[PDB]
Amino acid sequence: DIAGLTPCSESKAYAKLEKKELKTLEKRLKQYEADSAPAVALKATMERTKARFANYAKAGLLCGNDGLPHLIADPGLALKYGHAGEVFIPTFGFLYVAGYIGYVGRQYLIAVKGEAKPTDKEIIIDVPLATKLAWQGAGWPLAAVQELQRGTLLEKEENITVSPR
Amino acid sequence: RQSWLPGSQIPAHLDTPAAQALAGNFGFDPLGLGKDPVALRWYQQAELIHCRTAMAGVAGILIPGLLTKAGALNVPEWYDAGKVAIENSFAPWGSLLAVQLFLCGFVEAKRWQDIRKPGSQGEPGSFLGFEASLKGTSELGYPGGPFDPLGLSKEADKWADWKLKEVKNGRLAMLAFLGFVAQKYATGAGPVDNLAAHLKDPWHVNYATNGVSLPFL
Amino acid sequence: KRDAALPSWMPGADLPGYLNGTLPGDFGFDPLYLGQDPVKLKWYAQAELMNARFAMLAVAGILVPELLSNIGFSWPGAGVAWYDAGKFEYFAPASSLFGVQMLLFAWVEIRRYQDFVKPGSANQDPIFTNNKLPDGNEPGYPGGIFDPFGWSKGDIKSLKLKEIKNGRLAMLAFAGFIGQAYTTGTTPLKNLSTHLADPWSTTVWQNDLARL
Amino acid sequence: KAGNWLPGSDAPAWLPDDLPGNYGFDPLSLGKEPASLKRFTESEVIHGRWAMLGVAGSLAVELLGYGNWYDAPLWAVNGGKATWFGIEVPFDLNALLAFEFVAMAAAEGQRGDAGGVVYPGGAFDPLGFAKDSSKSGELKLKEIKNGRLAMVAFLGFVAQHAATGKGPIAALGEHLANPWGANFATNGISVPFF
Numbered sequence: 001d002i003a004g005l006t007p008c009s010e011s012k013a014y015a016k017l018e019k020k021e022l023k024t025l026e027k028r029l030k031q032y033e034a035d036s037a038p039a040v041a042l043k044a045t046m047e048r049t050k051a052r053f054a055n056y057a058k059a060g061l062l063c064g065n066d067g068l069p070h071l072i073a074d075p076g077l078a079l080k081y082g083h084a085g086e087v088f089i090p091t092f093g094f095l096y097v098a099g100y101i102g103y104v105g106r107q108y109l110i111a112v113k114g115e116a117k118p119t120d121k122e123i124i125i126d127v128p129l130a131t132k133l134a135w136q137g138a139g140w141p142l143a144a145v146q147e148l149q150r151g152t153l154l155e156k157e158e159n160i161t162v163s164p165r
Numbered sequence: 166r167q168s169w170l171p172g173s174q175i176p177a178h179l180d181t182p183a184a185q186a187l188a189g190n191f192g193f194d195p196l197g198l199g200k201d202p203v204a205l206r207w208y209q210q211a212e213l214i215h216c217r218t219a220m221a222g223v224a225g226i227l228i229p230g231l232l233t234k235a236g237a238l239n240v241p242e243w244y245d246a247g248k249v250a251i252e253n254s255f256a257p258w259g260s261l262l263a264v265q266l267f268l269c270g271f272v273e274a275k276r277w278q279d280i281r282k283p284g285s286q287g288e289p290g291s292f293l294g295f296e297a298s299l300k301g302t303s304e305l306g307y308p309g310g311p312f313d314p315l316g317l318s319k320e321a322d323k324w325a326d327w328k329l330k331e332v333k334n335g336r337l338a339m340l341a342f343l344g345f346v347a348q349k350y351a352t353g354a355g356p357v358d359n360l361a362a363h364l365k366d367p368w369h370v371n372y373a374t375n376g377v378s379l380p381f382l
Numbered sequence: 383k384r385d386a387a388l389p390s391w392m393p394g395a396d397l398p399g400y401l402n403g404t405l406p407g408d409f410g411f412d413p414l415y416l417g418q419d420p421v422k423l424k425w426y427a428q429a430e431l432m433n434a435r436f437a438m439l440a441v442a443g444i445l446v447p448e449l450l451s452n453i454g455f456s457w458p459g460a461g462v463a464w465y466d467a468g469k470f471e472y473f474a475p476a477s478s479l480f481g482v483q484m485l486l487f488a489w490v491e492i493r494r495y496q497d498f499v500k501p502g503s504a505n506q507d508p509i510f511t512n513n514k515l516p517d518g519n520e521p522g523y524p525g526g527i528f529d530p531f532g533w534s535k536g537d538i539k540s541l542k543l544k545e546i547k548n549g550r551l552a553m554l555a556f557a558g559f560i561g562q563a564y565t566t567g568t569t570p571l572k573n574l575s576t577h578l579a580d581p582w583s584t585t586v587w588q589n590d591l592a593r594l
Numbered sequence: 595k596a597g598n599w600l601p602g603s604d605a606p607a608w609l610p611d612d613l614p615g616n617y618g619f620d621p622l623s624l625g626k627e628p629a630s631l632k633r634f635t636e637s638e639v640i641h642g643r644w645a646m647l648g649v650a651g652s653l654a655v656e657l658l659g660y661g662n663w664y665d666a667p668l669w670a671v672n673g674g675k676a677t678w679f680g681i682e683v684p685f686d687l688n689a690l691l692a693f694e695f696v697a698m699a700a701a702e703g704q705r706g707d708a709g710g711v712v713y714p715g716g717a718f719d720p721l722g723f724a725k726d727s728s729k730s731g732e733l734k735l736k737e738i739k740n741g742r743l744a745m746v747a748f749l750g751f752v753a754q755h756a757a758t759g760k761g762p763i764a765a766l767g768e769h770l771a772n773p774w775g776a777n778f779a780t781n782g783i784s785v786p787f788f
């Protein structure tokens with residue numbers, strides 16, 4: 001398929017891998033009773049193992065000669081062949097959360113700079129203010145862009161200290 | 166002072182006289198997206214275009230849907246009409262969309278330049294004598310002129326009332342479309358068919374029992 | 383704020399000030415305050431007349447034709463339910479008749495609207511300029527050639543009240559035809575005969591409970 | 595002022611009284627700016643004159659039995675020889691486009707540099723009907739009203755052909771035969787239902 005890979009659902013090595021893991025679990029099972037606590041736990045593990053291998057095949061992943069899933073990172077190849085969920089979609093999932101955390105922290109830091117004693121507002125968190133800013137961060141991408149266009153996102157070069165040069 | 170949530174503190178930026186001049190101002194801005202006055206002016210235009218586009222689209226899903234059930238028309242489901250139309254069509258969907266982007270892009274571009282410089286499209290000689298009627302009105306997002314053939318915007322007494330009706334039906338239409346999308350995945354049927362099912366047995370056919378919305382239950 | 387001298391839909395009830403008896407049939411009924419805004423109430427005043435006047439014609443056009451058929455009077459259209467007149471075949475197709483209907487109504491309705499927008503501005507015959515309506519006519523009450531018998535020269539206020547009372551009752555009747563026809567499945571006069579046959583056991587409570 | 599398009603309505607201020615064909619009809623105020631009105635005044639007359647020739651040509655072709663206005667140019671796509679009053683014409687599609695483009699460009703180019711002359715006269719008025727100032731006023735009104743009627747008539751040909759797929763004279767005869775059976779309502783397209 002892509003880069004010589006093949007769908008895991010059609011991969012011989014992938015299928016053989018599932019048998020090896022289930023065989024290992026089954027070997028430990030036969031040293032216990034039918035419905036003892038250890039036996040139930042082992043059976044639960046085997047169910048998750050079977051579900052995991054079905055899910056990855058159902059997801060249409062690609063397996064190499066190793067018979068293990070490989071991920072596609074190029075946006076063009078991902079959207080071309082329906083691998084957007086491996087790296088492309090999770091890319092924009094992380095950035096939203098990462099920007100959320102960073103934007104919320106920046107809002108709080110600016111908020112307390114106006115207080116009389118900013119340092120004491122950092123070791124001892126102002127929880128009522130932090131919760132207020134935590135919820136308003138859901139719209140950070142909109143607020144972040146508008147700050148950039150209005151020119152209030154960055155400090156002036158003349159207001160930043162620098163070493164002799 | 167009507168508000169979306171009585172007893173709550175209206176955001177300060179929504180209480181200014183400029184903000185209260187906006188139709189449908191019920192003080193709803195919990196995330197503070199409109200704090201910057203320049204941003205709120207831009208988001209108001211976005212709502213109007215979303216409102217008007219949603220109303221036209223919903224009317225195109227709902228009215229054909231009811232008439233189809235009544236037997237006066239035969240129109241496929243809104244989520245199938247795209248495939249049905251392209252078959253007995255003079256062009257493939259690639260060519261059809263490319264033209265759509267040129268025409269929409271050109272028209273949208275003129276609207277864009279009016280947001281940046283209101284009344285700037287009435288530049289003498291810019292259009293083939295038609296620029297005079299493209300100046301818009303004193304209110305951004307309400308062009309008027311050739312876009313108001315019946316002149317319903319010339320009655321000062323009814324002006325505020327008309328704008329409120331548009332935003333109210335527009336907001337309702339926007340939610341309706343979000344319901345069409347969610348109800349297609351949830352139930353796998355048409356909008357009017359979903360309504361028929363609910364009315365038959367309201368207490369057993371709803372989102373609480375569709376087996377999707379509440380996975381824990 | 384409405385005075386207590388005027389008739390009231392609910393005696394001893396406070397009523398809106400803006401319903402001060404100027405309009406005919408002003409009994410102060412507006413629990414939802416729809417007509418509070420004078421501009422809107424100006425529109426609703428004409429809408430009531432238009433919906434009422436058509437309703438009076440429609441109800442008359444649904445009972446009299448059926449009444450004649452029972453009496454035995456014979457005409458080609460006899461014995462056709464009011465909701466089956468559309469299916470009936472006439473000298474011309476329904477579509478062609480509909481097209482003519484809108485073209486004819488477009489002229490008269492826009493003529494009527496022009497007067498409402500600017501009263502007295504549509505009182506002249508476009509072709510035979512000699513013809514003209516009286517200049518004192520108000521919106522909704524053209525007069526002139528529309529009042530050939532001069533009834534409007536008498537107690538006009540009473541006549542306006544009589545018109546709106548009959549009109550309001552007629553509008554309710556037509557809603558009865560749709561509700562009754564959709565439920566009973568028979569013509570209106572048939573429902574009346576059934577009720578008179580056994581008034582006590584033929585109420586809507588009896589009829590609808592049986593169905594479900 | 596020629597008249598009033600909507601009796602009981604006011605005339606727009608920006609429309610001059612002496613402008614020929616002035617019925618005070620400008621609901622959209624497209625001619626409010628004097629610069630825009632000057633261009634549109636010329637364009638209405640130019641459209642009217644072209645429409646009047648177009649309508650006359652469309653009716654003449656079908657009355658004389660040589661076809662209808664719609665299928666006259668089919669010989670080019672189908673493959674054939676042009677005809678005019680039944681006599682063969684040697685030119686082909688490529689030759690016609692080249693000569694038409696050159697001739698129209700030269701004639702229209704000359705008018706373009708004039709600056710917006712709608713009533714040139716002189717060489718274009720050999721019989722001198724409009725030489726007298728007083729007489730010209732009414733002739734201009736007659737020209738535009740016939741021109742406006744021709745513009746509407748041609749729109750009727752195109753719209754009617756799309757619905758019925760027939761020529762203008764064919765449709766007129768059909769309507770006369772069965773007035774209540776053949777009309778826009780009965781063509782199955784103009785009125786969505788029925």
Ligand code: CHL
Binds near residue numbers: 464466468469480
């Ligand atoms: C006050 C306005 C008004 C009202 C309340 C009605 C109400 C009605 N009309 Mg009527 N019409 C009205 C005005 C008019 N109608 C017509 C022409 C017709 C026709 C031709 C028909 C009706 C029929 C109907 C019924 C529709 C329900 C039904 O049985 O559907 C089920 C429909 C059918 C079983 C008919 C199937 C065959 C039909 C040829 C298909 C095409 C029907 C059209 C789409 C109807 C369009 C009606 C619209 C314009 C009001 C219902 C009783 C129908 C009827 O009487 O059914 C018993 C019918 O066939 N109307 C005209 C044109 C002159 C009107 C103009 O204003």
Ligand code: CLA
Binds near residue numbers: 080
């Ligand atoms: C990090 C850098 C990087 C690199 C090395 C590649 C590499 C590749 N990309 Mg990807 N791509 C990237 C980033 C990158 N991409 C980004 C950031 C985006 C936008 C989110 C895309 C969007 C994209 C699309 C839409 C497509 C590719 C495709 C390709 C392949 C051939 C064309 C190409 O991009 O040539 C070298 C790359 C560059 C010079 C960098 C810019 C690449 C642009 C954005 C895309 C060019 C597409 C090209 C015109 C398609 C022509 C048809 C093709 C079959 C020959 C190649 C494997 C094509 C593919 O699937 O081929 C099988 C394809 O259709 N890429």
Ligand code: CLA
Binds near residue numbers: 558559561562573586
């Ligand atoms: C103009 C008013 C009017 C009149 C005189 C009638 C008369 C009749 N209706 Mg109808 N009806 C009306 C309006 C009217 N209806 C309306 C507006 C609707 C829609 C909700 C219906 C829905 C309806 C149904 C579903 C049924 C009837 C039935 C009946 C019958 C009486 C038994 C019953 O269940 O009544 C129920 C009706 C009502 C409670 C009417 C309430 C609304 C009106 C406007 C009240 C008016 C009161 C006022 C004092 C005037 C009285 C009449 C006046 C002439 C003195 C009888 C033939 C039944 C039938 O056909 O039995 C064989 C039947 O099944 N009607």
Ligand SMILES: CC(/C=C/C=C(C)/C=C/[C@@]12O[C@]1(C)C[C@@H](O)CC2(C)C)=C\C=C\C=C(C)\C=C\C=C(C)\C=C\[C@@]12O[C@]1(C)C[C@@H](O)CC2(C)C
Binds near residue numbers: 196218245
């Ligand atoms: C434009 C739109 C829909 C357009 C639909 C169209 C053209 C459909 C067209 C067609 O269907 C037809 C006719 C026929 C079909 O055959 C084909 C297609 C092509 C499919 C919907 C918008 C829909 C838009 C929606 C639902 C937007 C909702 C926004 C919300 C709720 C925002 C809330 C807040 O932002 C505020 C206001 C303030 C903040 O402080 C707080 C939060 C909470 C963040």
Ligand SMILES: CC(/C=C/C=C(C)/C=C/[C@@]12O[C@]1(C)C[C@@H](O)CC2(C)C)=C\C=C\C=C(C)\C=C\C=C(C)\C=C\[C@@]12O[C@]1(C)C[C@@H](O)CC2(C)C
Binds near residue numbers: 624641645749
């Ligand atoms: C309908 C039309 C224009 C209509 C305009 C309208 C209603 C404008 C209305 C308003 O703007 C006002 C005034 C004022 C605003 O406030 C309001 C609105 C409402 C906006 C023009 C037609 C214009 C029509 C024209 C120019 C037609 C030309 C036809 C020709 C040359 C035909 C030639 C041939 O037919 C032959 C002879 C033989 C065939 O074989 C070959 C061919 C080539 C087909």
